[PDB]
Amino acid sequence: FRERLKELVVPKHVMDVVDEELSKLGLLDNHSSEFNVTRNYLDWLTSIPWGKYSNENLDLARAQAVLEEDHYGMEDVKKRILEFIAVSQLRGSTQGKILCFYGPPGVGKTSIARSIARALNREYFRFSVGGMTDVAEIKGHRRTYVGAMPGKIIQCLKKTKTENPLILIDEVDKIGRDPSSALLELLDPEQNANFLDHYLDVPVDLSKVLFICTANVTDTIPEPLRDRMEMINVSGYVAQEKLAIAERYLVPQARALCGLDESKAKLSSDVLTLLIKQYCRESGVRNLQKQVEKVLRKSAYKIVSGEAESVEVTPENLQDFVGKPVFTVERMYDVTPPGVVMGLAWTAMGGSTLFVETSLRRPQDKDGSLEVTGQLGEVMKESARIAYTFARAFLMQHAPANDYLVTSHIHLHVPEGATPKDGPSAGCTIVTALLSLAMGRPVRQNLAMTGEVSLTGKILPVGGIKEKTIAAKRAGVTCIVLPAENKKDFYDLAAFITEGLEVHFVEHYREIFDIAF
Amino acid sequence: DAIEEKFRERLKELVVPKHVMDVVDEELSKLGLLDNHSSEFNVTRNYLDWLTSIPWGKYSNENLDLARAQAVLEEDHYGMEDVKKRILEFIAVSQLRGSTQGKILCFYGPPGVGKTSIARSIARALNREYFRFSVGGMTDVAEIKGHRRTYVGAMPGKIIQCLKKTKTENPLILIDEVDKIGPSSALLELLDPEQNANFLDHYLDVPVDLSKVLFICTANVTDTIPEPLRDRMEMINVSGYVAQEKLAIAERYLVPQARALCGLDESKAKLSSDVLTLLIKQYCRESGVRNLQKQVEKVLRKSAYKIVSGEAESVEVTPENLQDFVGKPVFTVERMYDVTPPGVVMGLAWTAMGGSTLFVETSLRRPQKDGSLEVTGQLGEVMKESARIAYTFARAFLMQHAPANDYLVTSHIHLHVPEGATPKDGPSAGCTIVTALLSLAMGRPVRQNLAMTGEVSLTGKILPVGGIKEKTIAAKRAGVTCIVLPAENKKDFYDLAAFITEGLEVHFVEHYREIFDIAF
Amino acid sequence: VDKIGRGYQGDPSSALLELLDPEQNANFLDHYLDVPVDLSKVLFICTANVTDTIPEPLRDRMEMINVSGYVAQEKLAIAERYLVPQARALCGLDESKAKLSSDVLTLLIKQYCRESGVRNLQKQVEKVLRKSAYKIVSGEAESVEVTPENLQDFVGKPVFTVERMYDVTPPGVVMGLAWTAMGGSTLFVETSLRRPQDKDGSLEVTGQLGEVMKESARIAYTFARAFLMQHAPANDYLVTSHIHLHVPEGATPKDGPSAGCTIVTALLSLAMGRPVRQNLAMTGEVSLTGKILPVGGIKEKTIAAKRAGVTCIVLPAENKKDFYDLAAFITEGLEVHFVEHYREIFDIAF
Amino acid sequence: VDKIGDPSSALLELLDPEQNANFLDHYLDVPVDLSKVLFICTANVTDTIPEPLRDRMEMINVSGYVAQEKLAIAERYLVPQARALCGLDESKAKLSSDVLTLLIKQYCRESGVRNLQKQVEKVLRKSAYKIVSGEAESVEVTPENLQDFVGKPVFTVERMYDVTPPGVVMGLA
Numbered sequence A: 001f002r003e004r005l006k007e008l009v010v011p012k013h014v015m016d017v018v019d020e021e022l023s024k025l026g027l028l029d030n031h032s033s034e035f036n037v038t039r040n041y042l043d044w045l046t047s048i049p050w051g052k053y054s055n056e057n058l059d060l061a062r063a064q065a066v067l068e069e070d071h072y073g074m075e076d077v078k079k080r081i082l083e084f085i086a087v088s089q090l091r092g093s094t095q096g097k098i099l100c101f102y103g104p105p106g107v108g109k110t111s112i113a114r115s116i117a118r119a120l121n122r123e124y125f126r127f128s129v130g131g132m133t134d135v136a137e138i139k140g141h142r143r144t145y146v147g148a149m150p151g152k153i154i155q156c157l158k159k160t161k162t163e164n165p166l167i168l169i170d171e172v173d174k175i176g177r178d179p180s181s182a183l184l185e186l187l188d189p190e191q192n193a194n195f196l197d198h199y200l201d202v203p204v205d206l207s208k209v210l211f212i213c214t215a216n217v218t219d220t221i222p223e224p225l226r227d228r229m230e231m232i233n234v235s236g237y238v239a240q241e242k243l244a245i246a247e248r249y250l251v252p253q254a255r256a257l258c259g260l261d262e263s264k265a266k267l268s269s270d271v272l273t274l275l276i277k278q279y280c281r282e283s284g285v286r287n288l289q290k291q292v293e294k295v296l297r298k299s300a301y302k303i304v305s306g307e308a309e310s311v312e313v314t315p316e317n318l319q320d321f322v323g324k325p326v327f328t329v330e331r332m333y334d335v336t337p338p339g340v341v342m343g344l345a346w347t348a349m350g351g352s353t354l355f356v357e358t359s360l361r362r363p364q365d366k367d368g369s370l371e372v373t374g375q376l377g378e379v380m381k382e383s384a385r386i387a388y389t390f391a392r393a394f395l396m397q398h399a400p401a402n403d404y405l406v407t408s409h410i411h412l413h414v415p416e417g418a419t420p421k422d423g424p425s426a427g428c429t430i431v432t433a434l435l436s437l438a439m440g441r442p443v444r445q446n447l448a449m450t451g452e453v454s455l456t457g458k459i460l461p462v463g464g465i466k467e468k469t470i471a472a473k474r475a476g477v478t479c480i481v482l483p484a485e486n487k488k489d490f491y492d493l494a495a496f497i498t499e500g501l502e503v504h505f506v507e508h509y510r511e512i513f514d515i516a517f
Numbered sequence B: 001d002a003i004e005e006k007f008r009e010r011l012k013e014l015v016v017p018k019h020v021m022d023v024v025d026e027e028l029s030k031l032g033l034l035d036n037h038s039s040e041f042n043v044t045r046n047y048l049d050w051l052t053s054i055p056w057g058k059y060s061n062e063n064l065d066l067a068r069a070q071a072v073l074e075e076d077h078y079g080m081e082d083v084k085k086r087i088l089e090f091i092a093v094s095q096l097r098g099s100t101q102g103k104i105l106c107f108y109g110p111p112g113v114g115k116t117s118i119a120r121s122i123a124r125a126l127n128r129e130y131f132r133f134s135v136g137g138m139t140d141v142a143e144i145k146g147h148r149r150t151y152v153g154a155m156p157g158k159i160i161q162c163l164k165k166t167k168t169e170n171p172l173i174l175i176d177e178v179d180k181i182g183p184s185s186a187l188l189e190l191l192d193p194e195q196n197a198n199f200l201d202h203y204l205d206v207p208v209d210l211s212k213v214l215f216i217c218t219a220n221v222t223d224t225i226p227e228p229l230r231d232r233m234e235m236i237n238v239s240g241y242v243a244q245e246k247l248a249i250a251e252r253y254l255v256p257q258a259r260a261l262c263g264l265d266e267s268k269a270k271l272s273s274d275v276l277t278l279l280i281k282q283y284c285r286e287s288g289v290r291n292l293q294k295q296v297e298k299v300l301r302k303s304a305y306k307i308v309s310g311e312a313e314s315v316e317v318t319p320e321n322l323q324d325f326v327g328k329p330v331f332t333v334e335r336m337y338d339v340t341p342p343g344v345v346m347g348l349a350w351t352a353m354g355g356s357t358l359f360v361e362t363s364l365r366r367p368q369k370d371g372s373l374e375v376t377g378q379l380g381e382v383m384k385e386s387a388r389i390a391y392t393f394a395r396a397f398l399m400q401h402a403p404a405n406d407y408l409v410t411s412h413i414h415l416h417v418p419e420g421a422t423p424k425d426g427p428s429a430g431c432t433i434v435t436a437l438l439s440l441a442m443g444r445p446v447r448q449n450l451a452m453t454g455e456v457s458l459t460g461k462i463l464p465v466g467g468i469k470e471k472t473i474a475a476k477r478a479g480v481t482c483i484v485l486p487a488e489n490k491k492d493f494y495d496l497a498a499f500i501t502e503g504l505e506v507h508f509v510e511h512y513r514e515i516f517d518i519a520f
Numbered sequence C: 001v002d003k004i005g006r007g008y009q010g011d012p013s014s015a016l017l018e019l020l021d022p023e024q025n026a027n028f029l030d031h032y033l034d035v036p037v038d039l040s041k042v043l044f045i046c047t048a049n050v051t052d053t054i055p056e057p058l059r060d061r062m063e064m065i066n067v068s069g070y071v072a073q074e075k076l077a078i079a080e081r082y083l084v085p086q087a088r089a090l091c092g093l094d095e096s097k098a099k100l101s102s103d104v105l106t107l108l109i110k111q112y113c114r115e116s117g118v119r120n121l122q123k124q125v126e127k128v129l130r131k132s133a134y135k136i137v138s139g140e141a142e143s144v145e146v147t148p149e150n151l152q153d154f155v156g157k158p159v160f161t162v163e164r165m166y167d168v169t170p171p172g173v174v175m176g177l178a179w180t181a182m183g184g185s186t187l188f189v190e191t192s193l194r195r196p197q198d199k200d201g202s203l204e205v206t207g208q209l210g211e212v213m214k215e216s217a218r219i220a221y222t223f224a225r226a227f228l229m230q231h232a233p234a235n236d237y238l239v240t241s242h243i244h245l246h247v248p249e250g251a252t253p254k255d256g257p258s259a260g261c262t263i264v265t266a267l268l269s270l271a272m273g274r275p276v277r278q279n280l281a282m283t284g285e286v287s288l289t290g291k292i293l294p295v296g297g298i299k300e301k302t303i304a305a306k307r308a309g310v311t312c313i314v315l316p317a318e319n320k321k322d323f324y325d326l327a328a329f330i331t332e333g334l335e336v337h338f339v340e341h342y343r344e345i346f347d348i349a350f
Numbered sequence D: 001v002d003k004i005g006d007p008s009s010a011l012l013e014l015l016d017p018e019q020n021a022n023f024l025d026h027y028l029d030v031p032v033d034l035s036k037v038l039f040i041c042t043a044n045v046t047d048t049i050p051e052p053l054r055d056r057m058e059m060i061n062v063s064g065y066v067a068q069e070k071l072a073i074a075e076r077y078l079v080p081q082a083r084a085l086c087g088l089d090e091s092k093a094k095l096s097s098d099v100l101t102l103l104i105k106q107y108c109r110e111s112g113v114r115n116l117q118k119q120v121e122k123v124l125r126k127s128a129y130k131i132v133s134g135e136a137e138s139v140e141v142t143p144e145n146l147q148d149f150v151g152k153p154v155f156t157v158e159r160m161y162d163v164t165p166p167g168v169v170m171g172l173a
């Protein structure tokens, strides 16, 4: 009854509400519907914590030791959390921000939230806005409908019993059809102080909550939401990074979940590099986690079934635990013919490498044409047209007797003809492929290039230098050609990502021609 | 019975009209006959709760001191001249007629230019009550007009809830994002001085008097607003700020507020004007100070960390060490061509994020039966048709000027506008395309620091264009020293601040012959 | 009534079919009363902007009567007889403290307020009046006068200033008239040789033309060929030349079956190397054999012609009733020629 | 579980092993420990609304059956149960192996046995009628009268060509 509120610091308006609802409760009689609906209303109103904050430890070094020990890498998230702690110290009060991590699947966006709430000692709640289409799942129903529930944030405040509980909203890319309004008001510093749930009319404060959001790509998020939160990039890992993550975090966790311990089941680091290079193709450690779980589960069975008293997974018997090595190519061409050139692409899942093939379409050396296939977007077809024009101009100025590309009928294809692809990059790639076909020369053998081209030959910047460079390193390239204006993007990469890479920053195509031949 | 007294007491400080009093008496006498357990009693008590929580005569005591209100406005925002002049005229009229009043305004402009915050500043300057009301993406008319008492989940809609929350009958309601409304025929009644005096909410079933509410709508564009709704409300433009205004805003409003938000002191964290100019010029590219606020907050956060953690006792940010806080510059090019080849010409464009500079490149698709022109660069249909017009006029002009050229009628040309991923549109760049074609044909480059904008017709007439301010700013920023505008944009250009048109040798033209004699 | 929601759950425009039945109003059955109520003595008045959005069964029960817009003279009368006095009653000013002379109001209508309604004129009037009130109550003045020179200091910069692209027409252009919501509008039709020689010819059109207008261009091109063949059988222009036709202001979309005669005249003037009469607008749909067919919006087109300084207007002969139903001040100084076939337009224009 | 309608958060809380020990139901005010019950859930597509379920739910994929496995299933489990349901027995109505392979190959090609079950029930109902009415004191189904029981074959010869001319080549879909 009224004892659930003597520990709470109840506001005045909600005090009037609970008083008038107590009057209604007392005037009504038992075993009646109205009695029960008022009972539920008052129970919900007296279950909300109206004045309490969780004791938040603003100690810097302890929180840094907490964060740095349960998650590898991810410097941006930890730096932002430490600055958050510093600002909370200076302000003297417990404050709240709105953050958003975006990155490929399985890079720690969800577990870093839990470790963060453990560091700040706040509570923790998670709920996904993925498939929801009606706003009553957040704002709640109304007290009049036959089945009435107060939503999914009042439930947070009730079960956590706090006013700053670090709500994590997973997967805000997926949104039905628009609850984005309720989302924004929930994620707005001007609409947070008063929330006004639908079930219980009285508003509640949310300006102390720490809203963390996780997405895979920023563009599917509504533009209104793309301004009420900061954007921290959680990036994918490399082979050695994945291996460190595996050894230090995945094997212990999966093992302690399966029941075994360090003696009864081991995984040599060579087995882990096998499960990384071949049995997995990703920028995260999700499928790697599944593979390690499968290995340890079969190990647990072989233990309990009495086939062996301890298992040591080696490269010699990994097949008995996972089967055959999918992904045993790692790049289409090993030695490129005169017509094909390696290019770099990227997407939300991470970087990727692709090739641009050219060929003659009719048997000779009335102008030539250029067929283009490969499920290419409109921008990519226009870039191919620009590349064709500039390649003809360049071949005329450099080898005025070739006559190729002027009388020849060419066909240009980008393999994997099933997957669609777009973008203004690979213009320099298309120019290089056409010129190498016209000259009958193959380009340097481990070489990838990325960069937009213009009708006069200038090389314009591109995007996603980090992921493209990761993919080029993984595909085993030694040289790489970039636009000169992406130097600042390239030199933000860690020192171990750009070790065996010979880099060239160019402004005009003549430099790319000098490099590729 | 005590609820009869509670309802009859709420209407003591109110001057209730006659029809509302009739409805209240009927509903009270009806409530005095129901059973406290039936749903009829619940719905009648809800009706009498909503009927008495309307401020039937309660007005707020507005501040009508012009000097006090001007001082309030001038110390909350910066340079919103038209909005402040409008509110001062509003006060002047309310003072000259002695009674309160209501209007329906619409502030429209690019994002982040303080449209939705000047509303709160005005509500404070006027001593009104402020209410937020978002309409973007709304689809249900029952949010404006409500449902009957009959239905279960029945609320009286947003305006009645406003009147109940603000407790005054002349609040300031900010109908936000009327250009993105999904439903809009209810607003035709909400804000229409004819019907406005008797607004019928479907729940109350008794008309309210919104004739003294100051409605303020915000939008980014006026093209997506229905024509009658644009006919109802008054449009007031809130344009984006130039670099100097952005600097003044950062120095006066953004850095102090971000220090307050980060819990700093002025002695601890300092940002010189050079650092702020560097931010504005290189780390953010938009019309209003919205990303600049984020950059300032980031710098101050990293300063707070360097202090609390124990690095230093004071942080003094310089244009040198600014990298250690926000990283490397983002927009440090300012121009694609330094010396234009014989076939490229610099044009001007603009968007909601300010103005831009783009070049029109041309070249030969085939060596040395007529010619063709292939255009690429993600051009809209208007831009492609302008390219066709430019091609035809360039052919005719070169025929009349150099009759023995034979170019432009026998050559196959490719025309490109770089940044091939960016979609472009608009009838301008006609003169730019004509100049590109003629320069490629004659083998001559244009004047070296020259930008031109203007729609061309089939006989060579230069027609007016839009966004002279933004194009002029972008040309000045890109190091342009000669600008060629249409003659009918002369007043648009001369109504610009003196610090924009300072070092620009401008030329106003009517026919293309004048542009040709300039550019060559 | 043209804005009722036809939602997934609810179509009230079908429940109106009983409320507005001239014969079945006498027994209108409400679902709460369950007793028919005689409604045949009620004066129902509906208001709409567009008529086609009302279902035909419903549109048949109403007596649709039209409330047209206002021409400049009616707008000036409305202003100085209802708007300025009401604006003064609102802003609490007096006739003696700020006077809006008829010259100022005429200029304000001519340059700023051009649509059919009278709702923007109200806003400009009260803008002037509130700026005067702020000058007065702030002590910057004790009385304000608004003249046609300091008007731009009150309302801003004019919105309409040119009214005419070409003042003297070259051998390829010809003036046509259009219907707009902001009064009428004048537009020209430019034609130009596209290739360096006077294997057949071709016509390319630009200017954001609708489908009906492109078809009108095709028909006008065919008839222009036929007419120039019968008239000057040795011209050979329009048969082997590559023409480009442009309706300037290439950003705004334009449509309609009019401008047939305009396009024929443009092509013929280009072929003969002759400009048309220097103050001559024309409008009319042409057919494949040359017949000039009726058009719409005669009031607006005539207003726009008279406003752009046109002295000779040409209309189809079946628009004579439309033209002579216009007020006396609209059609007083215009030499109008009504035509049935195109040959008459050719004789007028040359 | 993917045909569920708030029941989503209710299940999300129920399956949780930290809220498992205290499951207070609205009828019994007394809590009950459910930390010893074993929960299994089945579905057909993993495109249901809650994603944090799939974080706690361990997905296992039950693939289809090739024709041999379907025939073995039909001979061992399906036909006995259908006989039990129709009241027949192996002496009265017999379904040989070749007729079952024919039935699978020409009528039921999906990944499950939902269609083959209805087909064998159809055969057994026709057989029950034939033995009760008196057309035959015992029925023997054979690949030359199965259509008299189930109607026309659904699938066909599967080879448009037997010997390919110079132009045509067989691909697989």
Ligand SMILES: Nc1ncnc2c1ncn2[C@@H]1O[C@H](COP(=O)(O)OP(=O)(O)OP(=O)(O)O)[C@@H](O)[C@H]1O
Pocket (backbone or CB within 6 Å): B076, B077, B078, B079, B080, B110, B111, B112, B113, B114, B115, B116, B117, B118, B218, B219, B220, B249, B253, B288, B289, B290
């Ligand atoms: N001239 C100015 N003076 C002071 N502050 C300003 C000014 N312009 C913008 N701001 C600041 O910008 C911030 C946000 O601006 P606001 O959200 O009002 O922009 P907006 O135009 O409403 O954006 P949107 O159209 O997207 O709603 C406010 O905190 C405000 O202080």
Ligand SMILES: *[B]([O])([O])[C]([C][C]([C])[C])[N]C(=O)[C]([C]C1=[C][C]=[C][C]=[C]1)[N]C(=O)C1=[C]N=[C][C]=N1
Pocket (backbone or CB within 6 Å): A343, A344, A345, A346, A347, A352, A354, A380, A419, A420, A421, A422, A423, A424, A425, A426, A462, A463, B421
């Ligand atoms: B480039 O950076 O623009 C690049 C060119 C690529 C087609 C060789 N495009 C991409 O990488 C796109 C993403 C994108 C970039 C820029 C604009 C629009 C889209 N990714 C892909 O095309 C792709 C295709 N298959 C697999 C992975 N990624």
Ligand SMILES: *[B]([O])([O])[C]([C][C]([C])[C])[N]C(=O)[C]([C]C1=[C][C]=[C][C]=[C]1)[N]C(=O)C1=[C]N=[C][C]=N1
Pocket (backbone or CB within 6 Å): B347, B348, B349, B350, B351, B356, B358, B383, B422, B423, B424, B425, B426, B427, B428, B429, B465, B466
């Ligand atoms: B012009 O004013 O028409 C201009 C031509 C430009 C492509 C050289 N176009 C634009 O300025 C458009 C805005 C617009 C104006 C008029 C009608 C429709 C649209 N802006 C852009 O195309 C653009 C492209 N890239 C970056 C920024 N703006």
Ligand SMILES: *[B]([O])([O])[C]([C][C]([C])[C])[N]C(=O)[C]([C]C1=[C][C]=[C][C]=[C]1)[N]C(=O)C1=[C]N=[C][C]=N1
Pocket (backbone or CB within 6 Å): C176, C177, C178, C179, C180, C185, C187, C252, C253, C254, C255, C256, C257, C258, C259, C295, C296, C297
């Ligand atoms: B005509 O009367 O059809 C005319 C042809 C004009 C392009 C020379 N068209 C219009 O008047 C249209 C309205 C219309 C009337 C009748 C049928 C279809 C359409 N208006 C416009 O074309 C226009 C032109 N410029 C600006 C705005 N509107």
Ligand SMILES: Nc1ncnc2c1ncn2[C@@H]1O[C@H](COP(=O)(O)OP(=O)(O)O)[C@@H](O)[C@H]1O
Pocket (backbone or CB within 6 Å): A070, A071, A072, A073, A103, A104, A105, A106, A107, A108, A109, A110, A111, A214, A245, A249, A285, A286, A289
């Ligand atoms: N640095 C890391 N240390 C430990 N675990 C990691 C790390 N990076 C990723 N993981 C693993 O990734 C998984 C979480 O991925 P998540 O961020 O949920 O991806 P998504 O939400 O995009 O599917 C966890 O199993 C976690 O163990």
Ligand SMILES: [Mg+2]
Pocket (backbone or CB within 6 Å): B115, B116, B176, B177, B218
């Ligand atoms: Mg706004």
